Amino acid sequence: AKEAYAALLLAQAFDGPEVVAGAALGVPPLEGVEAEVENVWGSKVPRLKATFPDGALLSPVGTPAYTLEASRAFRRYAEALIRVANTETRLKKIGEEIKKTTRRVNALEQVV
Amino acid sequence: DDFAYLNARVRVRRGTLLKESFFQEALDLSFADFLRLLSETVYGGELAGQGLPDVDRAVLRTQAKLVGDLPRLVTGEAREAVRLLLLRNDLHNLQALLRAKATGRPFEEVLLLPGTLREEVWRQAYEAQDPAGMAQVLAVPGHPLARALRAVLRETQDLARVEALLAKRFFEDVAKAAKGLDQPALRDYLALEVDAENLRTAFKLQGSGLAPDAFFLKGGRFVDRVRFARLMEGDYAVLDELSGTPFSGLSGVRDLKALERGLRCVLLKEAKKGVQDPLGVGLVLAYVKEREWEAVRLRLLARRAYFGLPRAQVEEEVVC
Amino acid sequence: MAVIADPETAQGFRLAGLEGYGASSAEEAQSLLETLVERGGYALVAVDEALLPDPERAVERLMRGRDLPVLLPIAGLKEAFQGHDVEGYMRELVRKTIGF
């Protein structure tokens, strides 16, 4: 992704600007949060995945080349950035639980 | 028409076209060291801080006076060819202005490139109502796109179509206008640019499924409607029929990155013939385009140096 | 939805979606944090290693039980990133859960 990110400046040093002007808001760029319920103890907690369309071509016709190639990286970015957004948050939550459970374990196990 | 002034200037400026070993050197002289290197060369008078963004700006101003000048004189044949160059940078601005104006982005993040209309005129054009009003701003200093846009606006004033037609139409208009300038060298570069443009459109839009003519732009040579169709619907074999042309280098390459790379080399080589034509347009093409290609290389190498990236990955990417 | 890194690198974001913002205008980003929550239609916010994705307390002070984007690790740009990859995984497991 970053390959093209800096490469696409070829003379596009300020036609990034142009291209975002000329082409953007042409594949969905905001909204698509699905709040999810899953096992949550005590006073409840939501998790979620926010996925909705987000990366391809949207410019009219060919227009510059680096544009198209760069926007293609978003396909590979956006999408991927979602997986870690949704696994890494699950991971830490279930972590707490894991701990919190062992907490009671302790009290019960050697207090009561 | 004027080659008196014109030629004498062109000969001096070519004297500061960096030595090949410079371009080798910058690769291995780190970002600080790069900053020194640029500053000791002619672009250096615009080393205005010291950092990567500073390189980009130094290039803009250094080119602005050195290339942006030729249309700024009179309107001989060469100036007309160059006018097309300034027009391409404008065109990019013009597309941005159309989507920006309709979708509520301010003028302010549009940053003008060197242009045939003055900035305050541009400011007035953005501020000048509908695309008709905008076009009306454009028509005043002498501009074939102004009328071209106006003709498009009678047929529809739906933005997306206006964009679609804006690229398509500007280059259809240029093609005929350029064809009347009446001597082989200018015609030859123009024709080769057509082949290349058709080739890139077909590659990039592949699988959008339409007819070759649905996206074909006139001027053909070795890149024709049949080839356009075959690839755009999907098939590489098109690239194997471009052997037996000056664009021989597509027959051992297949990707888009490599595609632009090869194409860029051929056009440079083609540009290199014109030192046997100091009173032909051959010399102006070679010099002006060369100053741009120098610019490409300075800027990439600036980035490479800034970010410390793998050497073998970028060294090729400024070499033919 | 939203992210931040330097402007100079940010642009890429700015192409398809990622209606990002600068990230060298604050070395606290709290400023941005709140601004982000003004609309709150962005369920995703992530940051470089420029800051650090360890003092989340800003978020806790603002959301205060209204889980809104977990700040995620990016990293300024690759130049190596895989070394501290297998590390970022291990760095987590010991201080979470149990120490080995």
mmCIF file with all atom_site columns, N, CA and C in Angstrom, chain B residues 162-186:
data_model
loop_
_atom_site.group_PDB
_atom_site.id
_atom_site.type_symbol
_atom_site.label_atom_id
_atom_site.label_alt_id
_atom_site.label_comp_id
_atom_site.label_asym_id
_atom_site.label_entity_id
_atom_site.label_seq_id
_atom_site.pdbx_PDB_ins_code
_atom_site.Cartn_x
_atom_site.Cartn_y
_atom_site.Cartn_z
_atom_site.occupancy
_atom_site.B_iso_or_equiv
_atom_site.pdbx_formal_charge
_atom_site.auth_seq_id
_atom_site.auth_comp_id
_atom_site.auth_asym_id
_atom_site.auth_atom_id
_atom_site.pdbx_PDB_model_num
ATOM 1  N N  . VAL B 1 162 ? -20.501 15.705 -16.904 1.00 0.00 ? 162 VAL B N  1
ATOM 2  C CA . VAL B 1 162 ? -19.636 16.809 -17.192 1.00 0.00 ? 162 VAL B CA 1
ATOM 3  C C  . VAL B 1 162 ? -18.199 16.444 -16.982 1.00 0.00 ? 162 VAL B C  1
ATOM 4  N N  . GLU B 1 163 ? -17.809 15.722 -15.914 1.00 0.00 ? 163 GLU B N  1
ATOM 5  C CA . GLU B 1 163 ? -16.457 15.249 -15.778 1.00 0.00 ? 163 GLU B CA 1
ATOM 6  C C  . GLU B 1 163 ? -16.072 14.330 -16.900 1.00 0.00 ? 163 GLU B C  1
ATOM 7  N N  . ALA B 1 164 ? -16.947 13.364 -17.229 1.00 0.00 ? 164 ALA B N  1
ATOM 8  C CA . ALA B 1 164 ? -16.646 12.308 -18.161 1.00 0.00 ? 164 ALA B CA 1
ATOM 9  C C  . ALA B 1 164 ? -16.327 12.887 -19.480 1.00 0.00 ? 164 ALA B C  1
ATOM 10 N N  . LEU B 1 165 ? -17.202 13.798 -19.868 1.00 0.00 ? 165 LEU B N  1
ATOM 11 C CA . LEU B 1 165 ? -17.049 14.531 -21.052 1.00 0.00 ? 165 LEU B CA 1
ATOM 12 C C  . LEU B 1 165 ? -15.920 15.485 -20.928 1.00 0.00 ? 165 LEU B C  1
ATOM 13 N N  . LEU B 1 166 ? -15.564 16.035 -19.749 1.00 0.00 ? 166 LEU B N  1
ATOM 14 C CA . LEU B 1 166 ? -14.465 16.976 -19.687 1.00 0.00 ? 166 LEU B CA 1
ATOM 15 C C  . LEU B 1 166 ? -13.128 16.423 -20.113 1.00 0.00 ? 166 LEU B C  1
ATOM 16 N N  . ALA B 1 167 ? -12.730 15.228 -19.619 1.00 0.00 ? 167 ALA B N  1
ATOM 17 C CA . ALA B 1 167 ? -11.518 14.610 -20.120 1.00 0.00 ? 167 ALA B CA 1
ATOM 18 C C  . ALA B 1 167 ? -11.589 14.215 -21.565 1.00 0.00 ? 167 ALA B C  1
ATOM 19 N N  . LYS B 1 168 ? -12.746 13.616 -21.923 1.00 0.00 ? 168 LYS B N  1
ATOM 20 C CA . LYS B 1 168 ? -12.879 13.065 -23.233 1.00 0.00 ? 168 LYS B CA 1
ATOM 21 C C  . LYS B 1 168 ? -12.816 14.143 -24.266 1.00 0.00 ? 168 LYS B C  1
ATOM 22 N N  . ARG B 1 169 ? -13.635 15.190 -24.048 1.00 0.00 ? 169 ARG B N  1
ATOM 23 C CA . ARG B 1 169 ? -13.774 16.357 -24.875 1.00 0.00 ? 169 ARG B CA 1
ATOM 24 C C  . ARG B 1 169 ? -12.552 17.195 -24.919 1.00 0.00 ? 169 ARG B C  1
ATOM 25 N N  . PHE B 1 170 ? -11.804 17.417 -23.805 1.00 0.00 ? 170 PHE B N  1
ATOM 26 C CA . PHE B 1 170 ? -10.651 18.266 -23.969 1.00 0.00 ? 170 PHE B CA 1
ATOM 27 C C  . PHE B 1 170 ? -9.676  17.627 -24.885 1.00 0.00 ? 170 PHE B C  1
ATOM 28 N N  . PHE B 1 171 ? -9.405  16.329 -24.695 1.00 0.00 ? 171 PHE B N  1
ATOM 29 C CA . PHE B 1 171 ? -8.479  15.686 -25.586 1.00 0.00 ? 171 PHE B CA 1
ATOM 30 C C  . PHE B 1 171 ? -8.930  15.457 -27.008 1.00 0.00 ? 171 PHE B C  1
ATOM 31 N N  . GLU B 1 172 ? -10.251 15.281 -27.291 1.00 0.00 ? 172 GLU B N  1
ATOM 32 C CA . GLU B 1 172 ? -10.744 15.296 -28.670 1.00 0.00 ? 172 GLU B CA 1
ATOM 33 C C  . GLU B 1 172 ? -10.461 16.625 -29.350 1.00 0.00 ? 172 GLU B C  1
ATOM 34 N N  . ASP B 1 173 ? -10.620 17.755 -28.609 1.00 0.00 ? 173 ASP B N  1
ATOM 35 C CA . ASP B 1 173 ? -10.443 19.094 -29.121 1.00 0.00 ? 173 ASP B CA 1
ATOM 36 C C  . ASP B 1 173 ? -9.009  19.354 -29.400 1.00 0.00 ? 173 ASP B C  1
ATOM 37 N N  . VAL B 1 174 ? -8.115  19.082 -28.427 1.00 0.00 ? 174 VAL B N  1
ATOM 38 C CA . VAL B 1 174 ? -6.693  19.212 -28.628 1.00 0.00 ? 174 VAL B CA 1
ATOM 39 C C  . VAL B 1 174 ? -6.256  18.470 -29.856 1.00 0.00 ? 174 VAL B C  1
ATOM 40 N N  . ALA B 1 175 ? -6.730  17.216 -30.076 1.00 0.00 ? 175 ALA B N  1
ATOM 41 C CA . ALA B 1 175 ? -6.224  16.434 -31.182 1.00 0.00 ? 175 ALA B CA 1
ATOM 42 C C  . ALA B 1 175 ? -6.298  17.048 -32.566 1.00 0.00 ? 175 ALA B C  1
ATOM 43 N N  . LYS B 1 176 ? -7.459  17.606 -32.932 1.00 0.00 ? 176 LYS B N  1
ATOM 44 C CA . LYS B 1 176 ? -7.616  18.335 -34.165 1.00 0.00 ? 176 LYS B CA 1
ATOM 45 C C  . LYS B 1 176 ? -6.863  19.619 -34.259 1.00 0.00 ? 176 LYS B C  1
ATOM 46 N N  . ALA B 1 177 ? -6.844  20.414 -33.165 1.00 0.00 ? 177 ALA B N  1
ATOM 47 C CA . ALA B 1 177 ? -6.171  21.692 -33.105 1.00 0.00 ? 177 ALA B CA 1
ATOM 48 C C  . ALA B 1 177 ? -4.689  21.521 -33.285 1.00 0.00 ? 177 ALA B C  1
ATOM 49 N N  . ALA B 1 178 ? -4.107  20.486 -32.633 1.00 0.00 ? 178 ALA B N  1
ATOM 50 C CA . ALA B 1 178 ? -2.709  20.123 -32.706 1.00 0.00 ? 178 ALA B CA 1
ATOM 51 C C  . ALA B 1 178 ? -2.301  19.606 -34.046 1.00 0.00 ? 178 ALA B C  1
ATOM 52 N N  . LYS B 1 179 ? -3.201  18.863 -34.722 1.00 0.00 ? 179 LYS B N  1
ATOM 53 C CA . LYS B 1 179 ? -2.958  18.333 -36.041 1.00 0.00 ? 179 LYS B CA 1
ATOM 54 C C  . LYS B 1 179 ? -2.717  19.377 -37.128 1.00 0.00 ? 179 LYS B C  1
ATOM 55 N N  . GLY B 1 180 ? -3.218  20.622 -36.963 1.00 0.00 ? 180 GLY B N  1
ATOM 56 C CA . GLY B 1 180 ? -3.055  21.727 -37.899 1.00 0.00 ? 180 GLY B CA 1
ATOM 57 C C  . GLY B 1 180 ? -1.737  22.479 -37.798 1.00 0.00 ? 180 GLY B C  1
ATOM 58 N N  . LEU B 1 181 ? -0.830  22.068 -36.884 1.00 0.00 ? 181 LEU B N  1
ATOM 59 C CA . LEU B 1 181 ? 0.413   22.756 -36.623 1.00 0.00 ? 181 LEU B CA 1
ATOM 60 C C  . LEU B 1 181 ? 1.561   22.116 -37.344 1.00 0.00 ? 181 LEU B C  1
ATOM 61 N N  . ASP B 1 182 ? 1.294   21.111 -38.190 1.00 0.00 ? 182 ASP B N  1
ATOM 62 C CA . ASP B 1 182 ? 1.616   21.228 -39.583 1.00 0.00 ? 182 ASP B CA 1
ATOM 63 C C  . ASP B 1 182 ? 3.023   20.785 -39.872 1.00 0.00 ? 182 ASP B C  1
ATOM 64 N N  . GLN B 1 183 ? 3.688   20.062 -38.936 1.00 0.00 ? 183 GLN B N  1
ATOM 65 C CA . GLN B 1 183 ? 4.979   19.516 -39.251 1.00 0.00 ? 183 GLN B CA 1
ATOM 66 C C  . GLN B 1 183 ? 5.181   18.260 -38.464 1.00 0.00 ? 183 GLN B C  1
ATOM 67 N N  . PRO B 1 184 ? 5.989   17.322 -38.986 1.00 0.00 ? 184 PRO B N  1
ATOM 68 C CA . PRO B 1 184 ? 6.123   15.978 -38.464 1.00 0.00 ? 184 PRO B CA 1
ATOM 69 C C  . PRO B 1 184 ? 6.507   15.777 -37.038 1.00 0.00 ? 184 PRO B C  1
ATOM 70 N N  . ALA B 1 185 ? 7.438   16.562 -36.451 1.00 0.00 ? 185 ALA B N  1
ATOM 71 C CA . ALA B 1 185 ? 7.846   16.239 -35.101 1.00 0.00 ? 185 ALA B CA 1
ATOM 72 C C  . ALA B 1 185 ? 6.769   16.385 -34.063 1.00 0.00 ? 185 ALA B C  1
ATOM 73 N N  . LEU B 1 186 ? 5.954   17.467 -34.135 1.00 0.00 ? 186 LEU B N  1
ATOM 74 C CA . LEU B 1 186 ? 4.894   17.711 -33.180 1.00 0.00 ? 186 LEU B CA 1
ATOM 75 C C  . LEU B 1 186 ? 3.806   16.724 -33.338 1.00 0.00 ? 186 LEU B C  1
#
